[PDB]
Amino acid sequence: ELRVGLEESELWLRFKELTNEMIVTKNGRRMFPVLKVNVSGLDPNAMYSFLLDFVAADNHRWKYVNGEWVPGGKPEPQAPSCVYIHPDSPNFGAHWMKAPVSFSKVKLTNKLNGGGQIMLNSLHKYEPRIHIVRVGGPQRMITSHCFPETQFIAVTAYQNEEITALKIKYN
Ligand SMILES: CC(=O)Nc1cc(C(=O)O)ccc1F
Structure with a gap:
């Protein structure tokens, strides 16, 4: 049975309970904390690709008002990320099963760009998701897993200094 687990869930939970923020830049900014995933129950000899994308957790624009994140009133459809x-x-x-699968090199951007970078809408709330795609084999197969603990708002700068402080303390 394919088991997918979040490494350092205790750290992610410190961020989640403050409302997590991830910087997006024109050229793209790496994530802290990094998504690291413990995987067991794969076929040691089978062949898999690991994909990361970001689900818009809701259809709203968020704003930091009087020290708290609040959703706009005017929802728009949020396209799935790349x-x-x-x-x-x-x-x-x-x-994949010998050490945590670490997405340390994904870069989050707010502008359609060359290659690698994932474009996110600023001030939208996102839920990281992985896909494990069995490749080359006869039967193609996909398993998807969400990480609620890793939800964040995409921001061009940190709003909640409590987040800034956690980022610096654990980086
Ligand atoms: C570099 C790499 O792994 N690419 C890729 C290929 C397939 C495919 O052949 O269907 C599925 C997922 C992938 F990420």
């Missing part, structure tokens, strides 16, 4: 292919992809089940 997918980031983990650079170790494609790779054997054994490669």
